[PDB]
Amino acid sequence: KTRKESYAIYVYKVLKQVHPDTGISSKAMSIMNSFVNDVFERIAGEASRLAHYNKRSTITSREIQTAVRLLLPGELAKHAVSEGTKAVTKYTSAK
DNA sequence: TCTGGGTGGTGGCCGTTTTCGTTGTTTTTTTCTGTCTCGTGCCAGGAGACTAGGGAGTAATCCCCTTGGCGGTTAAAACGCGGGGGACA
């Protein structure tokens, strides 16, 4: 029985974070997983293009941030950048 | 006293409002069923700790080209007049 990976459990955790008393259906979970994969691919591809354009061989958090600012619209981009910076700072704080 | 004009009342026609029944749809309570969510167990991917190397950060130098400004020419933009053909009712 093949072991197929998905974002189902993390999407569920985020859902219980925002709407504690609310479930999700299998079809909706599949749509959410597809959405996460699509956004991942878009941001990662834009970051790869950014690194290539600058003759840089590494994808850093700066490349991800610029990719996010390019892809997402105004307010969504602002808040995504805020969350990303928060997470990166919290990560570097701990070891 | 008669005729014309204007106002007031009555009647007729038209428009609006309501007024009503009829379907269609929404809401509510009961049923029941199958997928969502939780648990168990295993495993394999992530973590930890460590070494090696070079990608990239950083400083210094330089040489391009981006900015600024200035004057002369004149091509283009503006403003106006006029008319007719196109929008639209």
Swiss-Prot record:
Post-translational modification: Monoubiquitination of Lys-90 by BRE1 gives a specific tag for epigenetic transcriptional activation and is also prerequisite for histone H3 'Lys-4' and 'Lys-79' methylation. GlcNAcylation at Ser-82 promotes monoubiquitination of Lys-90. It fluctuates in response to extracellular glucose, and associates with transcribed genes.
Keyword hit for Methyltransferase: no
Gene Ontology CC: one annotated term: nucleosome
Keyword terms of this UniProt record: Acetylation, Chromosome, DNA-binding, Glycoprotein, Isopeptide bond, Nucleosome core, Nucleus, Phosphoprotein, Ubl conjugation
Carbohydrate attachment residues: 82
Cross-link (Glycyl lysine isopeptide (Lys-Gly) (interchain with G-Cter in ubiquitin)): 90
Major location (coarse): nucleus
Top-level division of the source organism's lineage: Eukaryota
Compartments, record wording: Nucleus; Chromosome
GO MF terms, alphabetically ordered: DNA binding; protein heterodimerization activity; structural constituent of chromatin
Role summary: Core component of nucleosome. Nucleosomes wrap and compact DNA into chromatin, limiting DNA accessibility to the cellular machineries which require DNA as a template. Histones thereby play a central role in transcription regulation, DNA repair, DNA replication and chromosomal stability. DNA accessibility is regulated via a complex set of post-translational modifications of histones, also called histone code, and nucleosome remodeling.
Similarity comment text for this entry: Belongs to the histone H2B family.
Subunit structure: The nucleosome is a histone octamer containing two molecules each of H2A, H2B, H3 and H4 assembled in one H3-H4 heterotetramer and two H2A-H2B heterodimers. The octamer wraps approximately 147 bp of DNA.
Name recorded for this polypeptide: Histone H2B 1.1
Annotated organism of origin: Xenopus laevis (African clawed frog)
Included range, full protein: 32 to 126 of 126
